[PDB]
Amino acid sequence: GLGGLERFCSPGKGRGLRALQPFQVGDLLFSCPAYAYVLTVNERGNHCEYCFTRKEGLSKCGRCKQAFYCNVECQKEDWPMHKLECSPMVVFGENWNPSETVRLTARILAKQKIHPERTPSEKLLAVKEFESHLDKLDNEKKDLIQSDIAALHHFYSKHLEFPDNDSLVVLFAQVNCNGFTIEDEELSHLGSAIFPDVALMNHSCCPNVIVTYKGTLAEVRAVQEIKPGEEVFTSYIDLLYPTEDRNDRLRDSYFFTCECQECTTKDKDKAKVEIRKLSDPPKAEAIRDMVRYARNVIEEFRRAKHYKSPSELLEICELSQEKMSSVFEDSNVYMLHMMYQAMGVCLYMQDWEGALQYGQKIIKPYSKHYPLYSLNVASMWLKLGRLYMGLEHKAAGEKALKKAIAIMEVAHGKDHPYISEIKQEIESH
Ligand SMILES: O=C1COc2c(CCNCCN(C(=O)CCNCCc3ccc(Cl)c(Cl)c3)C3CCCCC3)ccc(O)c2N1
Ligand SMILES: C[S@@+](CC[C@H](N)C(=O)[O-])C[C@H]1O[C@@H](n2cnc3c(N)ncnc32)[C@H](O)[C@@H]1O
Ligand SMILES: [Zn+2]
Ligand SMILES: [Zn+2]
Ligand SMILES: [Zn+2]
């Protein structure tokens, strides 16, 4: 197993991870090497396919020209996994489009063939033991899994010996239940991976640990003091949202309702859905209508980013914020969601001033809605610092970068390469 920790039966939460020794804020509980991992398509050329090192001058694979490495060693070591895609990418050309879930699942199947025995990534929980929620699958989810199975056969039949369709549905469901996104210091999506021992941890909206990445290695650090006998919890979702929103997401993606202190007390719900202090106060039904409108625009915008222009996307943000502002305060989470989306569009358009304008409005309400040590808060401070630095506002940039560092020292560790980069940004000016 893992020193100072153990697998146990968590009442009403299946299997979980329990502490056997105290952990202080910032302590590393454990590390978990990726069992299977894939670099996201849009990050190719920026990070090494094998070790995820972000570097300039990465060497391109000579055959496909769509895989980049540190050197010949990273190239060689990645070959058992890269071979699943190398020739297929050149053969299918423009038609090569398997989803990231399918890409990861192909790598799980390849790893099971090469290494059927328990790996150092499975000291407490094995990939084969993963919870699937197969019995809870509705028609919509089974149809999505069937599309994924067809893409798997379509793009990965060369090297893989497929189990029956029934075993594949269990696998795709286990991957959705237990799969991780690997994010960078700005929470930008890098890829997807399987960390079996990390997937043993249950969810809480007031977590006592944070998962970070050092290349393809997952690291688990305490963000609250943990005592012997206490269960180790991480957050599976974005904690900005009120209780109902959080539980709608947990029920849909993880088939459970959270009963943590935040979900039971609903303490932060009032400030999260802050209402304007108007002479004629807004009616209860007028609030409920705006909350319904707010959830609908969030989904409308989510769809729109796939086909609308940057100006159309900014229009949706501006127009929706205007309608919401008649009922909602600026610190309200639905206002903040649109502002964050608008900042993202500005960043893409390289409208640094516009991005800074939004980020400045988001930061204080983020600090109040998120937990004490939050990667969402650290990431926003970091973006702000980088925008300030890029726009020659060095004193403001240094202050924001140091706010990011203070959180990251706890979550990523004092010695994390990301902190060394940020300190170099402060020093280089
Ligand atoms: O064990 C875990 C896993 O989740 C955690 C997370 C969430 C990170 N993973 C997010 C990426 N991801 C998903 O969210 C999959 C959810 N699928 C959406 C709805 C759905 C659910 C079930 C099925 Cl059946 C299907 Cl059809 C569709 C997947 C996208 C595809 C690649 C794999 C990840 C954070 C901290 C954690 O500690 C955990 N712990
Ligand atoms: C990644 S697994 C965590 C390990 C899991 N308990 C097991 O036995 O394999 C995610 C699943 O654990 C359960 N789970 C996680 N957190 C929970 C919580 N706070 N309350 C109830 N169930 C939870 C749900 O069934 C969820 O889909
Ligand atoms: Zn490398
Ligand atoms: Zn190649
Ligand atoms: Zn909760």
Curated annotation (Swiss-Prot):
Keywords: Chromatin regulator, Cytoplasm, Metal-binding, Methyltransferase, Nucleus, Phosphoprotein, S-adenosyl-L-methionine, Transcription, Transcription regulation, Transferase, Zinc, Zinc-finger
EC number: 2.1.1.-, 2.1.1.354
Cellular-component GO terms for this entry: cytoplasm; cytosol; nucleoplasm; nucleus
Zinc finger (MYND-type): 48-86
Broad EC category: transferase
List of residues that carry Phosphoserine: S279
GO function terms (MF aspect): histone H3 methyltransferase activity; histone H3K36 methyltransferase activity; histone H3K4 trimethyltransferase activity; lysine N-methyltransferase activity; p53 binding; protein-lysine N-methyltransferase activity; RNA polymerase II complex binding; zinc ion binding
Impact noted for substituting Y241F: Strongly reduces methyltransferase activity on p53/TP53
Entry keyword annotation includes RNA-binding: no
Pfam families, per database record: SET (PF00856), zf-MYND (PF01753)
Taxonomy, superkingdom: Eukaryota
Residue ranges annotated for the SET domain, each copy included: 3-237
Keyword Manganese listed: no
SMART domains assigned: SET (SM00317)
Localization per record: Cytoplasm, Cytosol; Nucleus
Induction (UniProt): Expression is repressed by CEBPA.
Binding site for Zn(2+) 2: C61, C64, H82, C86
Effect of R249Q: No effect on methyltransferase activity on p53/TP53
CDD domains: SET_SMYD2
GO BP term, example: heart development
Binding residues annotated for S-adenosyl-L-methionine, in chain numbering: K13, G14, R15, H133, N202, H203, Y254, F255, F256
Entries under PANTHER family matching the protein: HISTONE-LYSINE N-METHYLTRANSFERASE SMYD, N-LYSINE METHYLTRANSFERASE SMYD2
Functional note: Protein-lysine N-methyltransferase that methylates both histones and non-histone proteins, including p53/TP53 and RB1. Specifically trimethylates histone H3 'Lys-4' (H3K4me3) in vivo. The activity requires interaction with HSP90alpha. Shows even higher methyltransferase activity on p53/TP53. Monomethylates 'Lys-370' of p53/TP53, leading to decreased DNA-binding activity and subsequent transcriptional regulation activity of p53/TP53. Monomethylates RB1 at 'Lys-860'.
Subunit structure: Interacts with RNA polymerase II and HELZ. Interacts with SIN3A and HDAC1. Interacts (via MYND-type zinc finger) with EPB41L3. Interacts (via SET domain) with p53/TP53. Interacts with RB1 and HSP90AA1.
Protein name: N-lysine methyltransferase SMYD2
Organism: Homo sapiens (Human)
Lineage: Eukaryota, Metazoa, Chordata, Craniata, Vertebrata
Gene label: SMYD2
